[PDB]
Structure 1
Amino acid sequence: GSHMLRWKHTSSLKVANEPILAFSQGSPERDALQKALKDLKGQTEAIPCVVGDEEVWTSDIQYQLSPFNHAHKVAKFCYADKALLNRAIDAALAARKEWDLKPMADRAQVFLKAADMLSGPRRAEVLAKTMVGQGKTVIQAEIDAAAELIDFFRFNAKFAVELEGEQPISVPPSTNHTVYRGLEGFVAAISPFNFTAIGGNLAGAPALMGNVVLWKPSDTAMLASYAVYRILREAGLPPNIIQFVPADGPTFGDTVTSSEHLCGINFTGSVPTFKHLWRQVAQNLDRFRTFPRLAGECGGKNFHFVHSSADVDSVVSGTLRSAFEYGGQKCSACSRLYVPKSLWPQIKGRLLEEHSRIKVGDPAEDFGTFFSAVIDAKAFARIKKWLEHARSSPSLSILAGGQCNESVGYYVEPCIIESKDPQEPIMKEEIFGPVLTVYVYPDDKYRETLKLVDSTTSYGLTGAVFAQDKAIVQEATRMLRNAAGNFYINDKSTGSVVGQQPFGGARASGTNDKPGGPHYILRWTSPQVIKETHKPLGDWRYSYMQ
């Protein structure tokens, strides 16, 4: 009855969150970052597509601009054509079996090594490239290109190594074992401009699980994205496991959804684009060798809801940060603030005072900058249109800000607007700019207003309640259960931390697969269960049949 299949013991991994650095004067990390920023000033990196180990150039040349100094081309790159994308698919597929057969721990090692490189010798580089290329301030780059990305890599490695210990029951005469296979085919990873870390996770998590990936990074985050890619390769990622293939969005989507070998799309970006990809997969369902798995994290129209018992100062600082950090360019950013009439004079006064102290400027040159320019000309134009809507709409009034200037960078001052209409389009539609809308509700209608918070928008991503009354917190928590997948009590609606607040939400905000938590990796494995029986079978008949 000897076992012909032998299964090895599964190991464990101890990881903790990457500490956030202070960047105090004279500190090594501040000195290193300043030097890295200096290294990037006046520089343009020519970034190729990478298929296997080959650097490939097409004639479709594109540029990434520095948002706060758009005269500065930080990168020249190119769009993969359909031929190159299909070549990348073929080469990835040819590399997949070997990679899938590698022990999980060996794949995890690549990501653990990459995390250590990001933590130490490459921290300043990835921070600086995120600052200059995406317009982030020091701390916004630090929580993203360093801490969050490092955390994704370490925590997903832990989750993946430990997943292999999740095994079924065996009863004599048989032994059962689950093999956590990668998906058969390739995964397309499509990442957004606003977080360097998201690109690394979208391509990296499926790769960890034995998949091969075509990664289309965001044009407006190309510089930092390529830095991450190179680090993964230096950390030991074999060729053809992640293909670095910037591309026109529609072209990329058309190509990957036309391949019989597509097994997954890991997407973060706009709802309409995700829906389009979902429809393309459905249209082509008959050609696929298996049913592709779509994961999408999309936008939000997120709320801070204030109860009369709230700590005012916390409401003010938490809301200023949530609404305006990184120019409000977060799917988690607060864009609607609900305030009870009893607290509005206090909160309005404080918001306006603090607003006047917010510095908008060049984040590389002036570390006093709270936030900088928005990402590109398209974002600037959209935000400008909303500011113009605020002036024209009889239900809207601009309380603070409203100015913008795109002469040097895509600069928009933080803007606070009051709406007298809780259903105004500005209360519903995601702007992705530093534009906060305030609705003041009578204290006596708090319950009815909680219903408005829940029903007004199509989104379900983040939200916060500020209140010190326990019963109120319990009630609001119950009522807003499906209004936010990441819900905050007396804290701001942004800044989820890996392993602490797994991130994502439903309604129109996506598929809610909770990257940052222990279950996300399950989307990228298709388990096989093996039963080995160690004794001969008996007759085909059963005893009761006699």
Structure 2
Amino acid sequence: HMDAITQVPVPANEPVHDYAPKSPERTRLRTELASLADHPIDLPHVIGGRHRMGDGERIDVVQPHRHAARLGTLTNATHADAAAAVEAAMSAKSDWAALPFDERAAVFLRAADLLAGPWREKIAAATMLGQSKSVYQAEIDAVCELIDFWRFNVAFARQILEQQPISGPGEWNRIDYRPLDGFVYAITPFNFTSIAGNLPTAPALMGNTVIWKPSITQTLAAYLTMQLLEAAGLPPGVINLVTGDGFAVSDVALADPRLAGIHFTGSTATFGHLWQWVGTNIGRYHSYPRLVGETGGKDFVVAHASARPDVLRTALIRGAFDYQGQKCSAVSRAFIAHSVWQRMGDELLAKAAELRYGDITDLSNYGGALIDQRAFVKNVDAIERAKGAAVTVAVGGEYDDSEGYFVRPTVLLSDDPTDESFVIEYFGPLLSVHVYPDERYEQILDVIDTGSRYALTGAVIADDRQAVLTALDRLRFAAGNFYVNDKPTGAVVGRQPFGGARGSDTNDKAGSPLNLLRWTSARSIKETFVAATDHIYPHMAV
């Protein structure tokens, strides 16, 4: 037993290492990079703690920047693999939920520290190699964001458990934050190792068990993440990894009456599909399935006449070309005041032309390649469509998939304000610029407001305080998270929570205590010390 009201360790954001030349983290990275690239492995399912290949189709995981070089080979999950995954989760449930919160929280605090230290460059390298991230992109994702999710989630949960009601006289009221009944189905995207690791672990923390199907092109980092958690003491069957395209996993998971929730990322259409499925089939499930996730998007930047040219240029290059434009959202559209374009337009184009995409084991590259052949084709189609469209290819537009899925940084010049519908059909290094007359700032904000339904983030570049405030007012609803004098980009944990595209309902996604509450079912407990012994009410008296 134990008699205490304990605290969890206070979290702070994990520092970002630079990997400068001659740094010790740089040397350790090269060691891990070589270790992973020279020794490809089976990428097995992990079900009830046991690691095995299944009988499904073998699919190679390759380096996107060098797709002749294989990192590993997984087996596409069969229905039977999926069924085993679900039985393993259900079977582990009782012992996992019976652990005190602190013991469950220690698993992820230990995992965070393992990732911060001895596992650091290995998870980063795995992410670099499988997902074609530069070391910086891997460091902010696979290391810092995942570590932050774990430590801040533990703190979030402890804060939740402490939210308690008022006790009136003669009584005692308490709230018990129960885990869910049944298993959680986590489906994770290629874009981030952090999301990949967090969607399955966040409900686990609250006492739930999980089947996890990661994206194929992220599976090397996913599998190592699974190993890391095991090394941290995660009991077998608490999270169950099944690899592949997810088709057979979804057949099984959505047919199981014990399905408690789905933690995922996807489009509005995907949400709608799952909504329609769960609603149509609600009578099949023991619990009402909880559908929790986020969408992707494409972002905008608007520069006022008072914009600092160099800050804008840099915000644009990073916002559009960090990770080859393959974050959950990237900057696709820039709205630049004429006088500002006169001052930094040529520089933007020149820097874009010089920007290096290549093998990310060459640390001098800015970035790598697109994630797979499918993503490559969509970028080529968008580029060709731009060439023929009455818009100019000011720089870039070159592509070559002979060795890696490489697409050059591309700037399009649109005479008229760029139509949003066109930029959402691909994810890649494609920036559209519209130059507008300085004096039409308010008109352009209205065009941005009127024509943006798919932005996660937006930014205004301006030193003028009125212009900043006007943008904050006028574009209040045109994007979720909004930025002043910086690139609009991914959130740091605990610093830019919430957001979402216009009209969305995703404030319960990862990044705040609201996400963890979805994986709980609160009940109130009331005890009355001296309750009534006569049912008569005062008003009934003669």
* TM-score past 0.5 threshold: yes
Q: Using the TM superposition, give the Cα deviation of residue 423 of structure 1 relative to its aligned residue in structure 2, in angstroms.
A: 4.8
1:477 corresponds to which letter in structure 2? L
* Equivalent residue, structure 1, for 2:456: 461
Residue aligning to 1:494: 489
Alpha-carbon distance in 2 for matches of 1:32, 1:510: 42
Between 1:57-66 and 1:333-342, the stretch displaced more is: 57-66
Q: Is structure 2 residue 180 aligned with structure 1 residue 183?
A: yes
2:117 alignment partner, one of 117, 120, 125: 120
| Pair 1:47-2:43 in alignment | yes
- How many aligned positions are there? 539
Q: TM-score under structure 1 normalisation?
A: 0.95
Which of 15, 20, 41 aligns to 1:19? It is 15
Q: Secondary structure at the match of 1:143?
A: helix
Partner of 1:168: 165
Q: Once the two structures are superposed, what CA deviation does each residue of 1:338-369 show, in whole Å capped at 9, x if it has no partner?
A: 111222222311201212321111111x2110
Find the residue that maps to 1:391 and give its secondary structure.
Answer: helix
| TM-score (normalizing by structure 2) | 0.96
Aligned match for 1:325, one of 309, 322, 335? 322
1:284 aligns with 2:284: no
Q: Which ranges of structure 1 fall in alignment gaps of 5 or more residues?
A: 1-5
Hey, what does 1:3 align to over in structure 2? none
| 1:420 corresponds to 2:415 | yes
User: Mapping of 1:386-397 within 5 angstroms?
Assistant: 386-394=382-390, 396-397=391-392
Q: Give distance in 1, aligned partners of 2:155 and 2:246.
A: 33
Cα distance between partner residues in 2 of 1:500 and 1:420: 37
2:128 aligns to what?
131
The 3 A distance-change label for structure 1 pair 509 and 59 is: farther
Return 318-327 or 336-345, whichever deviates more: 336-345
Question: What corresponds to 2:151 in structure 1?
Answer: 154
Within 5 A, what are the aligned runs for 1:63-212? 63-212=60-209
Give, in whole Å, the separation in 2 of the partners of 1:62 and 1:278: 31
Matches of 1:307 and 1:527 in 2, distance apart?
A: 48
Tell me how far 1:531 sits from its aligned partner: 1.0
Shift of 1:277: 2.7
Q: Distance in 2 between matches of 1:35 and 1:435?
A: 34
CA offsets per residue over residues 191-238 of structure 1, 9 Å max, x none? 010100001110011111111111000101000011111111111111
Structure 1 residue 56 displacement after superposition: 2.9
Moved more, 11-20 or 263-272: 263-272
Aligned to 2:264: 267
Query: What amino acid maps onto 1:102 in structure 2?
Result: L
Q: 1:532 to 1:94 in 2, by over 3 A?
A: farther
Unaligned runs of 5+ in 2: none
Aligned partner letter, 1:368: S
Output one character per residue of 1:434-490: Cα deviation in whole Å (capped at 9) or x when no partner: 000111222222212112212323314111111111111111111212222211111
**1-side partners of 2:44 and 2:444: how far apart?**
52
Q: Which amino acid counterpart does residue 63 of structure 1 have in structure 2? A: D
Q: CA deviation at 1:510?
A: 6.0
**What does residue 477 of structure 1 align with?**
472
* Aligned-pair identity (%): 45
Say if 1:65 and 1:72, in contact at 8 Å, map to a contact too: yes
State whether residues 418 and 433 of structure 2, in contact with CA within 8 Å, keep that contact through their aligned partners in structure 1. no
On the 8 A contact 1:426/1:437 being kept in 2, the answer is no
| Alpha carbons 1:498, 1:516 under 8 Å: kept | yes
After TM superposition, give the deviation of residue 393 of structure 1 in Å. Answer: 0.4
Q: CA deviation at 1:63?
A: 1.4
Q: Which deviates the most, 34-43 or 426-435?
A: 426-435
CA-CA distance at 1:161 after TM superposition? 1.7
CA shift for structure 1 position 425:
5.5
Task: Please tell me whether the aligned partners of residues 11 and 162 of structure 1 are also in contact (alpha carbons under 8 angstroms).
Answer: no
> Could you tell me whether the CA contact under 8 Å between 1:48 and 1:56 is conserved in 2?
yes
More moved, 513-522 vs 137-146: 513-522
Which residue identity does 2:164 align to in structure 1? Q
Residue of structure 1 in register with 2:398 after alignment: 403
Q: Is the 8 A contact 1:81 1:247 kept in 2?
A: no
Aligned match for 2:365, one of 362, 369, 382: 369
Tell me which of 436, 445, 449 is aligned to 1:450: 445
Q: Deviation per CA, 1:30-49, whole angstroms, max 9, x where unpaired?
A: 11001001112232110111
